[PDB]
Structures are given as structure tokens and as C-alpha cells.
Amino acid sequence: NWSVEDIVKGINSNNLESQLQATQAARKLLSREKQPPIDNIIRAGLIPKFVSFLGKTDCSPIQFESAWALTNIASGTSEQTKAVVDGGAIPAFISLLASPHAHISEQAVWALGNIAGDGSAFRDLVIKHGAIDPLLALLAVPDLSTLACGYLRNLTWTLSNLCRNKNPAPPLDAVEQILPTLVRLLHHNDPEVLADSCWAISYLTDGPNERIEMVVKKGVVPQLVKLLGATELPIVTPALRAIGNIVTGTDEQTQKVIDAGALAVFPSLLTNPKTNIQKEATWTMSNITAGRQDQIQQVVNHGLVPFLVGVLSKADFKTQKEAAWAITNYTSGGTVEQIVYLVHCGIIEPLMNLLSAKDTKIIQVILDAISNIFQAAEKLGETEKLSIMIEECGGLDKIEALQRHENESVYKASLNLIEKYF
């Protein structure tokens, strides 16, 4: 437990062993859980010294201790990561990826993951310095099972950080170069590797449908569905996020998700005790019911309409908002028979109950769904039965009250409903 002044004195001697002992003391200081003095180390001007120690190939202990200290600094705030980058760390760490000592190259992998995970500019700067080739060369083995578990986990985490941010998305060539290794990791039997691979895939599918397509042409959708059915929440959460992202794309990409059997997992996801799982599953469902009529029919055939009724009836309010979206998308794109089936499953009462929520968008969504169901009833000539059913559930007075809402869209929708069917 040295002081920062003693560390500085040790570093500023011209003595390689004294420097090594000071750097180790700095590593131990920066490794404590109780408020490590990162800012004091930075203000003392130590980062350039650590970076120059990264290149002392004759003294691998000081390479290791410097890499560890710098990794700890790069794990802090954006200002601290920037101080590491501004000391010249990025190319020095990329050079260290070639070290024959696994603990040293692992430390460089970790450091580059922290720098890249700071944000899209540093991720792109790490890519521009050429990290991807040596990172992938570390995984160029026929069977991933021959690598050390912790080493493989660190590489997967760092690779997922190179995929992470969105404004801008990572360069296409970088994604293309990383994707085969990412798919390998997505098939590797280690829960942490699986979780981090899934997160990477979820990042790469969040965006325009072209990015989704380049993910789905690798054939990962069946493995995502398999992981969707896992028992570990850290795996299910990113797998579900990735599936949800894919079903925001074209109808063919959504169909790839359906053909893999995703819908059979959804009864448990839509009843999962973890509210975030229920919310994301309902969001995914809402994007599937925004699809073609045969895809709505697949939702119906899997028995999922009663689960949508249930989550609309009782759930966290955000999950209920997602369920309202699912119902409006269903009623907008569904056949008359599908809409009749939805009403037969009991959607009217939970819709009316939610009409009392304070959120303006959910009210607009519910009114749009009611209008769509009324249009289906018109096509069937049963508008009066629908009006009676809505009144019996206490929705008539709610719409009557809403026709004097502060919002113009609510105004017009409720007024049109009252004037046309009531």
C-alpha cells in the first residue's frame, strides 16, 4: 500500500527494477475495491510511463503490471479511458496481443475491450489501429475447447464491445470480418461466452434491415432460438433481444424466426417472473403481429392470443403498453376471422380497463385497436353487438370522458367512435 508520491518517485528513478516495483504498487492501488485513486494517478502524469513500459519486451513482468494498471484506469469514466487513449495506449496494446505470455496478451485483450466499450469513436479508433486481425488470430484454433476458459471469455467480451454501439454502427468490413468467429462463439458451450456472443449478435441486429440480413444469412437464428429456451437468464435476455431485433425487419427475416420454432418458447417468456423478459417478449410479439396474415395465424395456432390477453390484463405497465401495441398491430393487419377470434378470447375488457391509464400514447393505441375491431364488425354487420359489449365492460363512459382529452388525436378518435357507433 504505497502512496502515489512514492509510486511517482519509483517511476522517476531510472532504475528498471525500482520502476517495476512502483508499477506493481500502482497496480495494487488501482485494484482495490474501495475508491481506487485513478484521478490521482492520472494527474501525477503516470500514464505515458505505463504506456512506454508496455513496450519493454525484455521485462515481461513490467509489461504485465503496466497493462493491468492501465486496464484498471481504462475501466473507469470516459475521461479516464480518454486519458489512457491519449497516452498512446491503443497501438501499444495491439502490439501486446502478440506476446508469448498468455496473461499479458489477455491483459491487452481486456484493455482494448474497455477502450472500445467506451463508445463508437473509440471502438472505431481501435478498429482503425488494426486490432481485429490479431484479436481473431488469437481464436484461430480448430476447436475453441482447447483454449483457457477465462482467456476465451475475455476475448468474447472484447469482440462484443467491438460490435456494440449504434451512432454510427461499426464499419461493415469489420462486422463481416468478425461474424464467422462470433458464430463459432455462439455455438460454444460456456454460459458466459454464450451470453456475450448473444449480446454481440443483439448489437449487430439493432439497426437497418441490411444489418439484420447480414446476421441472418450466417444461419444463427436456430441457435438463437435454442438459447432462447435456456435456463440461464444471462443467456435468455440477450437471445431474446436479438430475436426481437430480427423480427423488426422484413417479413422474410421474421419468417426465419418463426420457422426456427421461436413461438413455442413464448408461453413461458410471456409469463416470466422477470418483468424485463415479459416486456421484451411482448415487444417481440407486437412486431410479429405487425407481420403478414399467415404470421398472425402462426401466432394464433401456437395458442399465444390468450397469453396476449393475459399480459394485457395484468402485468407491469410497460409490458401492458407493449401488449396494447401487439393488439393494435394484430387488429390492423389481421383478417376478419382473426379479429373475431381475438374478441372471442376476451380482449375487450382488458382494453377498456387500460383505457383509464394516464399515458397518452397507450390511449391512442387502444382507440386505434377499437376502431380496427369496429371496422371488422362493420364488415360482418355486427357493430351493434360490439357496441353493447363495449358498454357492458364500462368503456362507453371512458370514451365519452376521453372525447374532451387535452390531445387532438384522442379528441378526434373518441369523437368519431361516439358519432359512428354510439
Binding site: 485494484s31 486496464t71 475501466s75 481486456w110 474497455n114 431485433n245 415487444w283 412486431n287 405487425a290 410497460k318
Partner: peptide, 23 residues
């Protein structure tokens, strides 16, 4: 187009932004 991508619901999100060693 009734499909809603991410950032149309909630926020960007994610996990494991940075990791310290602490070994």
C-alpha cells in the same frame, strides 16, 4: 409499417460497459 425498432421503446440499454480486473 407497424414494426417498431429499438430506441422507439425505452432506451438503448445494454450490459457490461467496462470491466475492472480487481484480481
Amino acid at each position: 409499417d407497424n414494426k417498431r425498432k429499438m430506441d422507439e421503446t425505452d432506451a438503448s440499454s445494454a450490459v457490461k460497459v467496462k470491466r475492472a480486473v480487481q484480481k
